[PDB]
Amino acid sequence: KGPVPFSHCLPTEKLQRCEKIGEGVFGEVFQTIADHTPVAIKIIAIEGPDLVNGSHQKTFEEILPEIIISKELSLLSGEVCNRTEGFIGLNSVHCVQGSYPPLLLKAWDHYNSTKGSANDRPDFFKDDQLFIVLEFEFGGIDLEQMRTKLSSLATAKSILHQLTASLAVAEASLRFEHRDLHWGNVLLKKTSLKKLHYTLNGKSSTIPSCGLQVSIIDYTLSRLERDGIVVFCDVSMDEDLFTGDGDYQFDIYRLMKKENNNRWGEYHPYSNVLWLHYLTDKMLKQMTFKTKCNTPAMKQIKRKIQEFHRTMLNFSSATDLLCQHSLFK
Ligand SMILES: C1=C/N(CCN2CCOCC2)CCNc2ccn3ncc(c3n2)-c2cccc(c2)O/1
Numbered sequence: 001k002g003p004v005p006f007s008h009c010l011p012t013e014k015l016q017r018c019e020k021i022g023e024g025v026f027g028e029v030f031q032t033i034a035d036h037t038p039v040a041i042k043i044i045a046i047e048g049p050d051l052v053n054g055s056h057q058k059t060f061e062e063i064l065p066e067i068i069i070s071k072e073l074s075l076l077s078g079e080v081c082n083r084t085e086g087f088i089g090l091n092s093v094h095c096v097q098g099s100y101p102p103l104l105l106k107a108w109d110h111y112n113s114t115k116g117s118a119n120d121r122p123d124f125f126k127d128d129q130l131f132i133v134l135e136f137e138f139g140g141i142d143l144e145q146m147r148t149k150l151s152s153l154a155t156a157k158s159i160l161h162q163l164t165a166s167l168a169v170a171e172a173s174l175r176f177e178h179r180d181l182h183w184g185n186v187l188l189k190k191t192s193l194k195k196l197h198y199t200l201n202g203k204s205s206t207i208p209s210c211g212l213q214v215s216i217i218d219y220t221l222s223r224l225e226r227d228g229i230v231v232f233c234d235v236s237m238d239e240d241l242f243t244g245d246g247d248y249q250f251d252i253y254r255l256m257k258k259e260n261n262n263r264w265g266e267y268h269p270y271s272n273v274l275w276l277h278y279l280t281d282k283m284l285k286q287m288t289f290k291t292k293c294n295t296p297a298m299k300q301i302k303r304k305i306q307e308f309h310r311t312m313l314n315f316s317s318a319t320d321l322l323c324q325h326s327l328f329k
Pocket residue numbers: 021022023024025029040042088136137138139140141142184187217218219
């Protein structure tokens with residue numbers, strides 16, 4: 001019933017181990033460790049009058065959708081009829097009050113020195129400033145940064161199957177659309193499991209992992225519903241979102257607006273198909289693999305992913321793809 005200080009989320013040792021791993025106009029993303037386990041910390045300023053990274057801060061009302069959707073997708077790992085671990089776990093959410101911790105500014109500076117930042121140094125916040133702090137499971141490294149790091153197109157097959165299954169399960173349970181599943185929002189982490197498990201409308205199956213587990217992240221533009229209450233980001237009056245160029249990613253925003261007639265409250269699971277097509281397109285055109293297809297068996301995998309690319313836009317949802325597409329048989 002009141003905000004907490006930063007130290008409540010980030011006690012001294014946890015704060016000392018923070019390293020910055022990402023950013024956006026929204027704010028900052030740090031990795032840290034507690035109980036021997038990495039976690040990702042996403043920090044968003046809210047409710048204040050300062051521009052931050054050139055944009056106005058969201059209100060608490062405007063941040064609730066991301067919080068709600070993060071929780072619902074996290075909970076899918078523990079459900080029965082519609083179960084998937086292909087989203088990202090949500091450990092906690094806090095409303096914090098205070099100026100930015102100097103130890104986080106230290107991490108911010110290190111990232112700016114080594115990778116470079118597009119953001120303002122977050123050193124201008126007063127002691128009444130509010131933030132949302134989301135703590136997530138650490139999901140690994142994004143697909144874009146793994147452009148040159150994957151073994152083969154067999155790995156790409158696994159990734160696309162994992163993504164399609166997770167989206168299908170969320171469609172079935174929550175009438176979910178991600179709406180921004182660019183390759184920076186697909187994370188990859190090593191697993192020793194040979195196969196991954198999901199359940200779609202009570203029917204369980206498995207996916208060969210190729211040694212990686214996929215997590216879909218970042219629900220800032222996503223949509224879902226429960227008992228007819230729809231949670232979403234109304235981008236109907238956004239200009240900039242629909243005028244990008246130089247990557248198929250930017251066409252997906254326009255294609256979604258075409259599909260939904262600019263009515264973002266509606267359910268159009270074809271948007272998940274569009275994102276999966278964009279990701280397949282990435283796999284075939286921008287990813288480069290350590291081992292190219294040699295064997296009959298691998299060459300068949302390549303042909304099957306090409307087939308997927310040229311046919312998948314004729315499916316109505318991730319659910320339709322998973323259940324009917326030959327790629328997953
Ligand atoms: C922010 C994503 N960032 C990218 C921001 N984009 C903003 C738009 O422009 C491109 C960058 C960090 C990505 N890396 C990363 C790494 C490990 N992890 N492990 C978990 C996340 C997580 N995130 C994560 C979970 C939920 C939401 C989330 C991150 O939200």
